[PDB]
RNA sequence: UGGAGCAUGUGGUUUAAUUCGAAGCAACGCGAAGAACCUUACCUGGCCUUGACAUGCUGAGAACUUUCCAGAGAUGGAUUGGUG
RNA sequence: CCCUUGUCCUUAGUUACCAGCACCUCGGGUGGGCACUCUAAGGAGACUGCCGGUGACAAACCGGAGGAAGGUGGGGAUGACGUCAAGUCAUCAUGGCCCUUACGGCCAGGGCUACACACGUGCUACAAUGGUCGGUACAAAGGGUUGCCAAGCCGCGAGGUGGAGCUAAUCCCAUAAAACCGAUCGUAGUCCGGAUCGCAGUCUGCAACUCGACUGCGUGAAGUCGGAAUCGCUAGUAAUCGUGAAUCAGAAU
């Protein structure tokens, strides 16, 4: 609604735009010439400060969109018999990495 | 007069010490102590020995140090204070050894052995 | 005179020959300037069965020095040039 | 790496039997000797079995392909 | 094997068969002012053009012995024969310092 | 089994002029580097007398007036169960838990500031009312059973 | 060190073709100090009847160009000249 | 006779730059810098040397000078040699059976990680010194006749048409260094978190049709005093800034 979810308060309005995954560095394009002062909050300023600050969600994609398109690509790989959904299917890292018995941040249980 | 060749070193320096009598005046790499030093301890550890002789008013000091880094080079304004002035008398002669200032040393980074780590630091094992 | 050749005790023994050769025969040359140890390190395994612990240790040197006829006229650093040399000194030379 | 530099496929020793093929009917495949042998983009809709030694592999050509090599019809491992 | 080091030794001369018509046509492609319909003609280079065109395939071992590990960039020798070639003579300028 | 160690702490300054204090850049310095450790150093110096009244040596030098245990307890054994031995002890041995004990046990409090957080409890060195003057009575009290551990079998 | 942040580091896992390697917290520094056209660890499409290469008896034509043709794939042969 | 010359040095810098200097853009154009110097080849170098006692006074063991350094500082590929039925009939070797129209033919029609876990465990932290940048006094020399690939126009960050270092006292990776008092709100399994869904982008070049660096952070986590008991530290030691180069074409944790 405001910035796509709830939002904890009492910090920045820079990292309250950097919320995990496309951002900041574009962001640095943004509040240099948009007008919005990193120098106070979201509640700090008035409301008319958020207002650019919620028109920039809805032009690429949507945590709906996001959760529209989340199995529509992963449908298309695993049951078309490829090596992007033999490991799909299967678990285990799947770009070339180290891959088969106990390397760390790939796989889980 | 006084216009002699001193030096002063800690690691791998090859020093200039433009010295003369003045007033305790202090100075490095063309620039004086104040400049590239300060804002850090090692200040008026160099003073003790200029306590020590009181000739914080009575000699003229330049003395250029180079290398390493930051503060490494910190004993080599230590190294060689009295290097340009026990040349010039022996007053302060048999006076000075408690002071413990000239020692070149060796606990350094010697070539570097195969087998181990480091200096004589030994790799990890049960 | 810029020179290109192997150690420490067959350059140094051929611009002894070098100096004074070619300051006989009328012109000057100057004092050898100092051109120091070339520092290479090396690493090998010299054990029989695989230990890679059991290395060894190797370097290797090239001397120059630079030396310069004032009045380009000696004849002798090119004349005796081959003189210079003995068994294994491939000397370079630059007559000024 | 793998930029889009190299853009068409013009190799004439691996050419000169599948894009003559428009002429004549689709009754029979592109027969493969390599675990690398891509062609044009303008060919989707063909068969091009993975070779590397036995048996042949069902490869379901669909209308839409843009990116990378043969590795995934008859995978890499294979599953013993 | 009496086959194996005779079997790939003859790529000095097979790699570098033409090693003229690739030595005008690698050069060139590094140059974008080649036009789009060049994109064929750059492509009817060198490979049908017999295959021992690619440099991909060859390698180095000892002159004498036969290893590719131990060769340094100063020698056509090995690991094996260092320790064996200074200590009757064989290598110039390695002496033994700091 | 001779010891060859040779003790020789230097004591001098160019900014404090102190005395145990003085060379102790070693565990202020944690391991990186001394452009961010200089604030840090002897930047808590001039934070324990600057929140209290009396000068910083002040609350410094009364640290081992009540944070220095009256024994020992080195183990060894005869042919029964081991025994301790505790006595006074030189005033160095006595004196080392006066200072480093107080200082280290600051990691579990960690208000703001790194120099504060070395400086929490420099000032607490005089009424012993904090954690270091708890341990230091404590050793005295596990001796009782220790207590006639020197001479016989010991 | 720790329900655990599922690497061929060997013992427990998945073939329709499988060659030897340590014997303890000296068991991932155990043939060789590197499997890029297989003339390698019999899948082998596949074919030998003299030979790349090591080899004696015999040759047109010394030689190469053998680019290109079947080749989605070595080469024989058109091999354009040369007769050395 | 085996890391082997601040310590002493005749003589030492044809093109570095600026102690003598004028100069300078105070980056040193440039003489002169051998003296208020620029990376040492190699050469007196460090002792049982003396004094005082202890010891059989004798091997030793303590105390001492000089004087900003005076007593012990094994740096081991033909181990001083002595050591535990056991790795290759295999890098040069070396036997009781074998293929022998063959493992002399070779252009090979693909068939090693179901997780069902233990384990040789050996950086990174525990949200607080808090969470996302383009910046400091500021690394920088060689190899370099099928090589390294500037200040690049390309840039947020990509230095592919350019090319000064082309045989390096130049330079190509040529940019740097934990600091000042680093923003607003002061101490938290989270405003440290993105594995299967980077699509898609004029560079090796006859050969990137459902997988590669290309780090823009919208997202899809698990880091809580380390207790059973165990790798392991008596001094520069327990202890957090990178490698320049080919069989002469730039991802050796």
Same mark, same amino acid.
């Given at each position: 609604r405001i910035a796509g979810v709830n939002i904890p308060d009492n910090k920045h309005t820079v990292i309250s735009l950097?919320?995990?995954?496309?951002g900041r560095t574009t962001a640095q394009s943004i509040c240099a010439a948009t007008?919005?002062?990193?120098?106070?909050?979201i509640k700090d300023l008035?409301?008319?400060?958020?207002d650019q600050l919620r028109n920039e969600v809805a032009k690429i994609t949507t945590e709906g969109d996001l959760r529209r398109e989340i199995n529509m690509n992963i449908k298309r790989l695993?049951?078309?018999?490829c090596y992007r959904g033999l490991r799909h299917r299967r678990g285990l890292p799947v770009r070339?990495?180290?891959?088969?018995?106990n390397a760390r941040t790939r796989k889980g249980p | 007069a006084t216009q002699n060749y001193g030096t002063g070193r800690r690691k791998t320096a090859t020093a200039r010490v433009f010295l003369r009598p003045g007033t305790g005046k202090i100075s490095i790499?063309?620039?004086?102590?104040?400049q590239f030093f300060?804002?850090?301890?090692?200040?008026?550890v160099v003073r003790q020995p200029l306590e020590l002789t009181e000739t914080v008013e009575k000699f003229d000091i330049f003395v250029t140090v180079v290398g390493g880094?930051?503060?490494?080079?910190?004993?080599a304004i230590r190294h060689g204070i009295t290097r340009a002035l026990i040349e010039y008398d022996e007053t302060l002669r048999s006076s000075?050894?408690?002071?413990?200032?000239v020692t070149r040393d060796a606990?350094?980074?010697?070539r570097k052995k195969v087998g181990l780590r480091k200096a004589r630091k030994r790799p990890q094992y049960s | 005179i810029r020179l290109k050749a192997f150690d420490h005790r067959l350059i140094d023994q051929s611009t002894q020959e070098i100096v004074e050769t070619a300051k006989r025969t009328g012109a000057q040359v100057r004092g050898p300037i100092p051109l120091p140890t070339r520092k290479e390190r090396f690493t090998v395994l010299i054990s029989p069965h695989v230990n890679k612990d059991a290395r060894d240790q190797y370097e290797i040197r090239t001397h120059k020095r630079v030396l310069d006829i004032?009045?380009?006229?000696?004849k002798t650093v090119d004349a005796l040039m081959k003189l210079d040399?003995?068994?294994?000194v491939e000397v370079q030379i630059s007559l000024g | 790496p793998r930029s889009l530099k190299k853009g068409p496929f013009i190799d004439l020793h691996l050419l000169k039997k599948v894009e003559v093929? $428009?002429?004549?009917?689709?009754?029979?495949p592109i027969k493969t000797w390599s675990r690398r042998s891509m062609i044009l983009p303008?060919? $989707?809709?063909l068969t091009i079995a993975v070779h590397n030694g036995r048996q042949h592999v069902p490869v379901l050509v669909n209308e839409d392909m843009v990116g990378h090599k043969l590795g995934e019809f008859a995978a890499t491992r294979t599953y013993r | 094997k009496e086959s194996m080091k005779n079997r790939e030794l003859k790529r000095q001369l097979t790699v570098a068969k033409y090693a003229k018509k690739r030595a005008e046509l690698?050069?060139?492609?590094?140059?974008?002012?080649?036009s789009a319909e060049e994109r064929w003609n750059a492509q009817?280079?060198?490979?049908?053009?017999?295959?021992?065109?690619?440099?991909?395939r060859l390698r180095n071992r000892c002159r004498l012995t036969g290893r590719?590990?131990?060769?340094?960039?100063?020698?056509?020798?090995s690991r094996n024969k260092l320790r064996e070639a200074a200590m009757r003579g064989?290598?110039?300028?390695?002496v033994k310092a700091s | 089994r001779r010891r060859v160690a040779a003790k020789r702490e230097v004591l001098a300054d160019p900014k404090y002029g102190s005395q145990?204090?003085?060379?102790?850049?070693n565990h202020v310095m944690?391991?990186?580097?001394?452009a961010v450790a200089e604030r840090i150093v002897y930047g808590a110096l001039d934070k324990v007398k600057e929140r209290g009244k009396?000068?910083?040596?002040?609350?410094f030098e009364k640290a081992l007036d009540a944070i220095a245990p009256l024994v020992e307890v080195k183990s060894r054994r005869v042919g029964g169960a081991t025994y301790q031995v505790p006595v006074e002890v030189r005033p160095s041995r006595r004196n080392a838990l006066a200072m480093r004990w107080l200082v280290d046990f600051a990691r579990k409090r960690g208000e703001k500031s790194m120099a504060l957080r070395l400086a929490?409890?420099?000032?607490?060195?005089?009424?012993?009312?904090?954690?270091?003057?708890?341990?230091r009575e404590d050793v005295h009290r596990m001796a009782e059973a220790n207590k006639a551990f020197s001479h016989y079998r010991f």
């Open positions: 950097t919320i995990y995954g496309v007008g919005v002062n990193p120098a106070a909050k008035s409301d008319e400060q958020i695993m049951d078309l018999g070339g990495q180290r891959t088969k018995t | 790499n063309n620039r004086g102590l104040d300060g804002r850090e301890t090692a200040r008026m880094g930051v503060s490494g080079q910190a004993g000075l050894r408690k002071a413990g200032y606990r350094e980074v010697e | 004032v009045q380009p006229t000696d040399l003995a068994a294994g | 093929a $428009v002429e004549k009917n689709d009754r029979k303008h060919m $989707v809709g | 690698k050069a060139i492609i590094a140059n974008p002012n080649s009817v280079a060198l490979q049908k053009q017999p295959r021992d065109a690619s440099a991909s590719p590990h131990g060769f340094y960039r100063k020698f056509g020798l064989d290598v110039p300028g390695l | 145990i204090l003085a060379k102790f850049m944690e391991s990186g580097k001394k009396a000068d910083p040596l002040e609350t929490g409890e420099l000032l607490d060195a005089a009424e012993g009312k904090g954690a270091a003057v708890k341990k």
